[PDB]
Symmetry: C5
Subunit: 82 residues, 5 copies
């Protein structure tokens, strides 16, 4: 899991049957200081996240249990402390 920020959204018509009715968001990985590093990822929205919102993204085989999905938002961050 990692902290990311919805940077945008991706639309695709000719996609896999398992991706039907899914919202594809562009999420940039953040650090502990909430500063975005170069990494960016296309994840599936499940909890219903909006732009600018900091979310918790689970990736890999774990993300399937939300599929050919390998990355999905599994929570919206309320607060963080370091």
């Amino acid at each position: 899991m990692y902290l990311g920020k919805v940077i945008g959204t991706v639309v695709s018509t000719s996609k896999n049957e398992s991706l039907s009715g899914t919202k594809l968001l562009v999420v940039a990985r953040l650090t502990e200081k909430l500063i975005p590093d170069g990494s960016t990822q296309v994840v599936v929205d499940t909890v219903g996240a909006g732009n600018g919102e900091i979310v918790i993204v689970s990736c890999g085989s774990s993300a399937r249990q939300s599929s050919v999905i390998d990355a999905a938002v599994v929570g919206i961050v309320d607060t963080v402390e370091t």
Copy 2:
């Protein structure tokens, strides 16, 4: 899943039986600004993608469901992209 652009194609005769009848494409990973970073990967085409087209690539165990030995495959062709900034 990441954004990629079909750079080319890979041909292989002596391959695994699970790769039978599969088109192996060369896909370079893109950023949010659609600028390709140094990373590149050989992925399996499933939706039927052509050269120069921006596609969505799924990797790992998820790509298998396209007993495969596939660990990366195209699962969609990008229609539009949207980067934003709020407030």
Copy 3:
């Protein structure tokens, strides 16, 4: 598995059903000399770790064994380390 240090904690109300009643910690990956590298990860606490504690973090499908959406979780609290 890697060596990490509990930097902090993450709170989230609107999260996945599998994450209900879970402690989300911010763990920074350490080297063999216990020096934290730039990498940081949000992991689920299972053994009950506190701030400043050095823990062992398991990642991937192995982290599920804590149908979870978990891909990183603390699976042990380090007693001692040695680098011969």
Copy 4:
């Protein structure tokens, strides 16, 4: 899957029971330009690859399907790879 070149081979007697009778090769990851980058990996040969040959390497859970402890294996030998630019 990525492009790699068989650099060498690794021998091990005291190994797992799933690695019995397996050829362990040292494969260095290549770019799309077939330039070897710093990455190197010990993969299991299945198609029968030799030194200097460019091969396709599958990694992760997919490599098990070659109770294996395999997480990286050669699943094909590259015949030709084409890079392109369109319009």
Copy 5:
């Protein structure tokens, strides 16, 4: 799988039940020329490896009720890197 060198060992009492009676080693990832790169990982010893020994480490689901994602699966006898 990658080439690694047993740098040390990790001890933990409050660990997962699946990790009971397991030897946790500190393994530094090596290159083809056997020079250790910055990467380091805590792996589970299964074949019985000692310090300074070059071992083959399998990672991910392959290493596995286990929560193991990295384990030693062999001790390297010899290596060769044809140029």
